[PDB]
Design a protein around this nucleic acid. Structure first.
Length: 178
RNA sequence: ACGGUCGAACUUGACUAUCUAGAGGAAGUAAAAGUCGGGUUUCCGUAGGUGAACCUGCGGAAGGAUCAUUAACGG
């Protein structure tokens, strides 16, 4: 029996505690994996028991809990539980353009937009989920959808206004046999 | 008449300033319906790319649209 341990930061302890039943129930019910949260090591531990139905379910659960810790909602990583062709690609915001200080903050703003609206628009077009950590961007979706979302985000964080980005991603989504 | 003094003005070169004729050159204008025919958020300073514009490099600005998380840490 093998196990996987994944860490949790201090800012994700309370979301883990509130959503704990919605996390451990799908892992143990139909995947059949033991789960605990070590408070000393601050780790979510997932284990294979005799009740595990099939191999690689523990990898599925590990991706689910890792996606929840990175900042995604519990149902958007339950999508990683159910679907097979889903991945979790992430990058830093300074990876494409060296931005210092206030400029960097403005880049973060034009991933969000007003009220988060711009971000949601990309999530509507690329069919992905984007999480903005403090200087990090995480995309959950299919491989081509991750490519479209990262193209939109990289276009946003090197200077393009949101309307041009919307038009470009709508043209690409029309061309992508969606 | 010698000499001294005040000194107009005259001649010669330089510095000039003004007035006044000009062969020629480079132009433009009116007359010829004569001949041939897509990219960009907005900038600043410096440098290069054929002068400017524009593009790129380097360093700066916003005069550019912040969503989500963050009470435990004791045995």
């Amino acid at each position: 029996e093998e196990t996987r341990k994944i860490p949790v930061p201090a800012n994700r302890y309370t979301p883990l505690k509130e959503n704990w039943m919605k996390i451990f129930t799908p892992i143990v019910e139909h995947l059949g994996l033991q789960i605990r949260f070590n408070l000393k090591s601050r780790n979510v531990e997932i284990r294979t028991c005799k009740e595990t139905k099939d191999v690689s379910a523990l990898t599925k659960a590990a991706d689910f809990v890792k996606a929840f810790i990175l900042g995604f909602q519990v149902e958007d990583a339950l999508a990683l539980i159910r679907l097979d062709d889903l991945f979790l690609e992430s990058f830093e915001i300074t990876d494409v353009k060296p931005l210092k200080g206030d400029h960097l903050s403005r880049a973060i703003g034009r991933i969000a937009g007003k009220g988060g609206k711009t971000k949601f628009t990309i999530e509507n077009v690329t069919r992905t989920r984007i999480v903005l950590a403090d200087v990090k961007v995480h995309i959950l979706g299919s491989f081509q959808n991750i490519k479209m979302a990262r193209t939109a985000i990289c276009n946003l964080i090197l200077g393009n206004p949101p309307s041009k980005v919307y038009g470009n991603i709508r043209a690409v989504a029309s061309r992508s046999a969606d």
